């Protein structure tokens, strides 16, 4: 059966209205999203990762970077970048793009990661190159400089190209979890919500642990439920074990 | 390329079957859902609101009205309506409708909220007008009257029109969270699941708090992840903080 | 409004790539998933079930079976199949298939449940017949036999036919919840994620209980949000109360 038309409602019948045009950016984003939504069968996995010791390590490295006057503040998302990059090395089918006809998968041998950054004009997604080959200090410096560029609205078209995977960390603003949409032509996206201290069973008692909620949405034409579970688990375990750089 | 047709299966070869036609209302709603699903890219945010003090206030107020013979029962969802109405005031992009070509956004000044009400014929969505201009007692009287009209199956078409936003509260029947579908031409819907006592860290120890799980699905063509996080946080904090009316 | 086409990106400008043709099985699977995603408006419910006593009962029964030389190991998923089968008996609208034009619902009087099993070629879903009429021991035998057959790539066409409902349990690989896609022409699917010991309020304190997270995705044209909650609640209550077989 044919599709019903979009509702044609005279909203003025119910009170005052103001009809505004969207910005070109929002029109471009909306068009891309409408395409991706129908072409990409979405599955979303949820998980929680223990970052108690990572956070202690981050604070340690932040004082030791200040003593050396290195001018760098390590933020949690840099660790997530490296964990995602290491996971893309272990399961390379997540580092891929599916052709339009669904018949051919392009496996990428480079690892670039887009990171959503909030601006006075909304979230934009700069792409960072060779994340798997860069350290925490270097990536923190790039993120600071480019996020500044984003807030000042002078981001370059080139600086948003070449992504293999997107991270969208919104926990500084809220949510305990969320289910993002895949940023085509990538096949997966990681959402990050607000960490919370939770009682966690150690086998004999509950102890307080800083738990970070993460989510993974993915193109189900490429990734099945089992591999999605393997992938998010690798990111979980990697983040809960990282204590170098 | 072209979509695979719907599966054709002779179900009678596995056992007894009975083919029934969908009701008149289910056919219309099913046609709307098919349209809304493919043209609205959904993101769903999850959150949990501390309603410990609010529930104590509600019961106290229900006692006050009882021992003064006011014949009004304050249910939790009326507080949710007021918090949503305050959020729609503070973030008016959520109180809007997108045109069918996705080019222009109608910002509504009035605030009417549809509230899912369960009936022997399933969930229906009566619409309550001027929620931002009505108190808790008045809205509770309206809810009592309309829910009976709904449960008795007497709702007119007018009583279901003009919605700006929908609340679907199913926690009385179960779920710890869920991801509802947006009710076009609205751009967001709040889901409400079953509250539970949870241990909540206060900086030194876990204390029991009554936490209410809520969810927000929204039209990603209109709302990005950052604004969705701001919005569900406003609903969260506003709801938790109510001590009046 | 015309749909924007798939992005045309020269990925070789960012680094080395390898283009691989999908296998036939993977092509068909994607085609089936692409159709299901656009024609089924998905809602997903989440829940957690207390399996503390069920697990001690399964462990006790697996010990009795070995001590009685019954030579059968009982896995958690057979209990879930029977709980789903009982839910399908109690809410027969979930045991159904919607017609291609969305106008007519085929109610099924037989109860067959597909169970996702991992293979060298990914998850596949053999179908088990008359789950509501089979005991726990008998279903475990079929599960063991057919799971090995699936891993060997030896499933017959008949062993995949007749499904009424799918259970997809990925908790041995990770996730705390997930949102599966409905396996058309069925109307719902249950996802099962990793169990965890959690603090559960008993009225005056928190006690550790083994909580199993489950999720229910369903065709919203058939099932409304309230019936979805009733259904996941029945599975929850039945699974958390089983002490026989």
UniProtKB/Swiss-Prot annotation, chains A, B, C:
Coiled coil: none
Signal sequence region: none
UniProt superkingdom: Bacteria
Result, substituting residue 220 to C: Abolishes catalytic activity
Sites of N6-acetyllysine modification: 13
Region span, Hydrophobic: 159-184
Residues that span the membrane, as ranges: none
Active site: 164, 220, 224
Task of the protein: The pyruvate dehydrogenase complex catalyzes the overall conversion of pyruvate to acetyl-CoA and CO(2). It contains multiple copies of three enzymatic components: pyruvate dehydrogenase (E1), dihydrolipoamide acetyltransferase (E2) and lipoamide dehydrogenase (E3).
Subunit and interaction comment: Forms a 24-polypeptide structural core with octahedral symmetry.
Recorded family membership: Belongs to the 2-oxoacid dehydrogenase family.
Name of protein: Dihydrolipoyllysine-residue acetyltransferase component of pyruvate dehydrogenase complex
Protein source organism: Escherichia coli (strain K12)
């Amino acid at each position: 059966p044919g599709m019903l038309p979009w509702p044609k409602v005279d909203f003025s019948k119910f009170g005052e209205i103001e009809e505004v045009e969207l910005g070109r950016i929002q029109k471009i984003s909306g068009a891309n999203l409408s395409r991706n939504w129908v072409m990409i069968p979405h599955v979303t996995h949820f998980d929680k990762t223990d970052i108690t010791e990572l956070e202690a390590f981050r604070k340690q490295q932040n004082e030791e970077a200040a003593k050396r006057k290195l001018d760098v503040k390590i933020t949690p998302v840099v660790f997530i970048m490296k964990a995602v990059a290491a996971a893309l090395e272990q399961m390379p089918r997540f580092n891929s793009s599916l052709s339009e006809d669904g018949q051919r998968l392009t496996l990428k041998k480079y690892i670039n990661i887009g990171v959503a950054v909030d601006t006075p004009n909304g979230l934009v997604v700069p792409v960072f190159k060779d994340v798997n080959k860069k350290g925490i200090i270097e990536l923190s410096r790039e993120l600071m400089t480019i996020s500044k560029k984003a807030r000042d609205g002078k981001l370059t078209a080139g600086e948003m190209q070449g992504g293999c995977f997107t991270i969208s960390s919104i926990g500084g603003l809220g949510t305990t979890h969320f289910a993002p949409i895949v940023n085509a032509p990538e096949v997966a996206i990681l959402g990050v919500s607000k960490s919370a201290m939770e009682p966690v069973w150690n086998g004999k008692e509950f102890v307080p642990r800083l738990m970070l909620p993460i989510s993974l949405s993915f193109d189900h034409r490429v990734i099945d439920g089992a591999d999605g579970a393997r992938f998010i688990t690798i990111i979980n375990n990697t983040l809960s074990d990282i204590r170098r750089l």
